[PDB]
Amino acid sequence: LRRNEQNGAAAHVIAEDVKLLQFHVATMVDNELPGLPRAMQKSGRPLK
Amino acid sequence: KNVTLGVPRLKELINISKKPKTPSLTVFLLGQSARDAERA
């Protein structure tokens, strides 16, 4: 997202980046909530 | 009769619950109905 704003990229991809960043921080503090699916570590195991 | 006791009842007493398993009223009588089975 930083290089998007440095380039001045499009808005829809920036919104998708904000969406994914929101999901990543939310599952970094709390990888359990009645929202998006859980985060896995690419090894078929949820993150703590 | 059959009344809940033991650790379920102790649970409910400490875990104060709106739904007793066996709620009851040990209700007493004072007139002649206390001794008269018919009036009781």
Added chain:
Amino acid sequence: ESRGFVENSYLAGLTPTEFFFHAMGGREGLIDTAVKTAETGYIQRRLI
């Protein structure tokens, strides 16, 4: 004897039906021991 009144003493030994009903009776002792251990500490830790 049909509904599980065993009439022999342990000295005399139980019959097959009597033995099976006695095993059924002792199974509840084992299970309620297990659930007592399951509730060990929980009430106590809540109280303390």
Added chain:
Amino acid sequence: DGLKYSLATGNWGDQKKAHQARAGVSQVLNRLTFASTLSHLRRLNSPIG
């Protein structure tokens, strides 16, 4: 490998979906005494469900 893993770990179902897989079906055989081996081989497990 697919059978092998499932028998090596006892997780049954899709390997990648092992989060919701039934576990403990396959167990290392208990070789402590012959009676224990026979008892383990003739064993039934009732899941909670």
Added chain:
Amino acid sequence: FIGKIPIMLRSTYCLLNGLTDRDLCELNECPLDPGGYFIINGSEKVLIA
């Protein structure tokens, strides 16, 4: 070829099928061993019913 299937010991396709106790001793296999388990990575695995 499509893969490899683990073989329960002393089944109809294990090499110890219908072998006399002498031959089991020659292969260093206990004739009283009941079988009914798989060998996965050398570990004896039994499937609980």
Added chain:
DNA sequence: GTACGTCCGGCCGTAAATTCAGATCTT
């Protein structure tokens, strides 16, 4: 030319939310 092979990219208790009867306003 061919393949390999190994180095890089993908239960129960709250608690919120939905529907029904006074009440002041509106008419």
Added chain:
RNA sequence: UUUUGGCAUAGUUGC
């Protein structure tokens, strides 16, 4: 000349 260590699981078992 003074080190040492996988983490999270799943199963089994003791009181």
Added chain:
DNA sequence: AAGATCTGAATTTACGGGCGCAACTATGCCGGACGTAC
């Protein structure tokens, strides 16, 4: 008087918890891409 509104009071999903510790075991996260050798 009538109404519409409309604002406080009865019914449905939905997290979120779920014995002290011991002891032992056994198992675990690729496929394109690029070169080099033969």
